[PDB]
């Protein structure tokens, strides 16, 4: 009947808000930002991201 009996058990362990491991933490916007953006240019073309700044890898 409670909130806990149902509606509960998503996601297993939760993280405090300020942490670099949150889903909303800038290491994420960084993360998904990069996973989306690495592919804009051909692996050859000079604009290629990982060719510019190899260390974002």
């Amino acid at each position: 009947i409670g909130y806990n009996n149902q509606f509960s058990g998503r996601a297993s362990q939760y993280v405090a808000p300020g942490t670099v491991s949150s889903m909303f933490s800038p290491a994420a916007y960084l993360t998904e930002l990069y996973r989306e953006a690495r592919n804009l240019h051909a692996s050859d073309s000079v604009y290629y991201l990982d060719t510019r700044r190899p260390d974002l890898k």
Binding site: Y3, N4, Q6, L33, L40, H41, Y47, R52, L56
Partner: protein, 786 residues
């Protein structure tokens, strides 16, 4: 610009390492988008991530904000404000708005929503076009046609950004929008295309006089009104093709990525897609300004090579776009229309609209019953209905940490093809599903347990078609993992599927609207009415329906199933679509609206500042707690692998704690603490009389007679802030406005009846001039006789 970092900045600017990494990538992305950097992949710029780049993804503040807006739709989505509500809902809110809110008024509302919805619900679907170069994104558009002689071709958008696992979010669908200009295409040739980022649809209609060939193309004005079409002469082009009467010339409308040049393509429909390659094909270019440039056999060929398999063989149809199997309309003999690209099938027509209206016309409680939702729909094409029963553990007693998924393969192992996905449990959870049959073996179920799946070559439960009315399991390997996998024969139907295309109207009618009237009631402060209105959705003690009692507590079915928080919280940044596709969020939203009803009563009794009523406040606050139950202890946990970002680009970060829902617990603790310690609603202490002085004999009376006469309309926490002279100048001004609306409406009505008079007269004038005409004829006949 090349290295994406300022070397000129003041040295006094302190910024984080990965914050500056962020600004780097954001600069890069922005430059691909304003397109200062020469060739940027147009498959990736077309991804959904960059269609939200402008409003959302371009900032940590918004992307975070909207990411929270999504990850907890429970806190935010409102029946009042939600993306993508159908027009019919608009007219509904209007019709109910225009009179005081209560059952009957809402009955009328629903009979209108349904008497309109019946026109559309089952609608023959003809052609379809897809946008994005990939099937995972972009928009698909359809073309419907009215069953009635009047054509009224309707068009309906749909998104695959909202398509997660085998289910559109039911909010990805537009309503059918009527096309104004009546037209008469030849056969099914009318086809839409996106061109100049705007919806076009071209229909070749050949006015006979020797059988003509020409086409007509037209497009859309922001209001939806359509501009008058445009002609091209294909007599020579189509004429070159072999015909008979099976002629249904191939129309392939292809959008070039840029410069706005449309690709139209004429082929003959061949029975097979395979040896079809290198067959002859004709095409014409349509440039930004309208010009027809016929295509050279070499050009037409090079466009074939990547084009074919987006257009289709005899009796079946595919979709066009800028696995890549396109997608296939199917209209079967059971009369159910749908779309299939991957083995996914999605019903876009619902046949019980008439029954639904009828059932609604009786009463409000007839349409919103659970049993109104159990009315079955014909199944999608072929396919094999079955139910699966599995114990929660594998590989061990403790087994996996959290969840599973269960798949199905195809001929020569095309794909694992997710159908259902599920979680750990105590109970084994018999679950029922539909298994598509499209045509050694027929179907088999792979299950992924997230740690040690068996995944054995063959293995699986086996299902065997071709026995013509009977499909049974021969396990031949497993079911060691699966308790009982039970075919159910003689079920050709399913209770109306809210993953279907008209599912949206079903969310509006069953779920959002009672929520809308429990909100619009709670605002008003008449609580037991609002309560009932949520009890159209969720109640403890379940429901006693027309007799005995039933177990389910959720009156809305999608809520009644699921109960399992899905692994992936979808995509596409629609706080709505991330529910609907995951109805848990509406169960917990309904839950929260309930607690807002109990906390609501609890304040309104709390603020009475009368001892007895503070006790009342305490029974309601206790009742909220007893409803929530124990505040769960969520173990904030730091175990972090410090990942190289390269690795984190693997398609993992832990969720946040969800304050607001906890905010319920600690705010209840706060209120109560303030009751026990006699502190009132803020901490501001009160000294109340033990025996409060009785209210005025008379004030009670005027209150009562006002109740008898009509309306609640009572100010509740008020006396407001303003002195009488000002509050009266303000109210008075208000009324003077209201009287102007009065006059102008009276004028609307006088004028309205005056109109219908003029019309009714002209209709009578015709009706008479007929008879008088016939008289005149007969008197000519009497001149014959003379």
């Amino acid at each position: 610009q090349y290295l994406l970092i300022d070397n000129q900045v003041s040295a006094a600017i302190k910024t984080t390492r990965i914050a500056e990494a962020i600004a780097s990538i954001q600069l890069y992305v922005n430059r691909a988008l304003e397109n200062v950097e020469e060739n940027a992949n147009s498959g990736v710029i077309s991804r959904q991530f960059f269609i939200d780049w402008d409003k959302y993804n371009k900032r940590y503040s918004t992307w975070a904000g909207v990411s929270q807006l999504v990850y907890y739709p429970e806190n935010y989505i409102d029946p009042t404000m939600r993306i993508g509500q159908t027009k019919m809902m608009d007219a509904l809110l209007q019709s109910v708005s225009q009179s005081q809110l209560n059952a009957d008024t809402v009955e009328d509302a629903f009979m209108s929503y349904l008497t309109s919805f019946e026109q559309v619900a089952n609608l023959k679907v003809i052609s379809a076009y897809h946008d994005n170069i990939n099937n995972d994104q972009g928009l698909t558009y359809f073309i419907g046609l009215s069953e009635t002689d009047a054509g009224e071709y309707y068009w309906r958008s749909v998104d695959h950004s909202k398509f997660n696992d085998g289910k559109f979010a039911a909010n990805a669908w537009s309503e059918w929008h009527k096309i104004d200009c009546p037209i008469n295409p030849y056969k099914s040739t009318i086809r839409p295309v996106i061109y100049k980022s705007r919806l076009y649809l071209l229909w070749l209609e050949q006015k006979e006089i020797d059988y003509r060939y020409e086409l007509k193309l037209a497009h859309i004005r922001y209001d939806g009104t359509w501009n008058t079409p445009i002609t091209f002469d294909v007599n020579k082009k189509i004429s070159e093709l072999k015909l008979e009467k099976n002629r249904a010339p191939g129309l392939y409308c292809a959008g070039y990525q840029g410069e706005d040049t449309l690709l139209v393509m004429f082929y003959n429909q061949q029975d097979t897609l395979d040896s079809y390659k290198n067959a002859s094909m004709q095409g014409l270019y349509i440039f930004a300004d309208m010009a027809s440039k016929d295509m050279t056999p070499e050009q037409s060929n090079v466009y074939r090579d990547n084009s074919y398999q987006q257009f289709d063989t005899n009796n079946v149809r595919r979709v066009n776009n800028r696995t890549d199997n396109a997608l296939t309309l199917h209209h079967n003999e059971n009369g159910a229309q749908y779309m299939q690209w991957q083995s996914y099938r999605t019903r876009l027509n619902t046949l019980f609209a008439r029954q639904l209206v009828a059932r609604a016309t009786t009463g409000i409680d007839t349409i919103l019953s659970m049993e109104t939702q159990n009315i079955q729909e014909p199944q999608l094409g072929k396919g094999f209905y079955a139910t699966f029963v599995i114990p929660p553990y594998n590989l061990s007693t403790h087994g996996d940490e959290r969840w599973f998924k269960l798949y199905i393969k195809h001929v020569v192992d095309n794909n694992s093809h997710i159908i259902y996905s599920g979680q750990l449990t105590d109970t084994n959870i018999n679950i029922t599903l539909f298994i598509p049959l499209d045509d050694d073996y027929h179907a088999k179920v792979y299950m992924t347990f997230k740690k040690s799946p068996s995944d054995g070559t063959w293995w699986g439960p086996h299902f065997v078609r071709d026995d013509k009315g009977i499909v049974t399991i021969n396990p031949k390997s497993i079911l060691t993992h699966f308790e009982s996998v039970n075919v159910l024969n003689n079920i050709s139907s399913e209770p109306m599927d809210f993953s279907g295309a008209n599912s949206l109207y079903f969310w509006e009618l069953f779920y959002y609207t009672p929520m809308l009237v429990a909100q619009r009631l709670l605002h008003e402060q008449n609580f037991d009415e609002a309560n009932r209105w949520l009890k159209y959705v969720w109640s403890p003690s379940g429901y006693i329906v027309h007799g005995q009692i039933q177990n389910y507590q959720w009156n809305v079915r999608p809520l009644l199933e699921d109960t399992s928080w899905n692994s992936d919280p979808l995509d596409s940044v629609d706080p709505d679509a991330v529910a609907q596709h995951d109805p848990m969020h509406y169960k917990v939203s309904t839950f929260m609206r309930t607690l807002d009803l109990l906390i609501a009563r609890g304040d309104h009794a709390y603020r009475q500042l009368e001892r007895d009523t503070l006790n009342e406040a305490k029974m309601w606050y206790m009742q909220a707690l007893h409803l929530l139950g124990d505040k769960p202890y969520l173990p904030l946990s730091t175990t972090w692998s410090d990942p190289r970002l390269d690795r984190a680009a693997d398609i993992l970060f832990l969720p946040q704690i969800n304050e607001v829902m906890m905010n319920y617990w600690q705010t209840l603790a706060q209120r109560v603490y303030n009751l026990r310690h006699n502190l009132s609603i803020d901490g501001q202490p009160l000294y109340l009389p033990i025996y409060a002085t009785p209210a005025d004999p008379k004030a009670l009376l005027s209150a009562a007679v006002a109740t008898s006469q009509g309306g609640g309309k009572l100010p509740e926490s008020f006396m407001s802030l303003w002195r009488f002279p000002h509050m009266l100048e303000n109210a008075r001004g208000m009324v003077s406005q209201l009287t102007q609306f009065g006059s102008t409406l009276q004028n609307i009505i006088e004028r309205q009846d005056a109109e219908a008079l003029n019309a009714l007269l002209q209709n009578q004038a015709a009706e008479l001039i007929l008879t008088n005409l016939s008289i005149q004829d007969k008197t000519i006949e009497e001149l014959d006789a003379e």
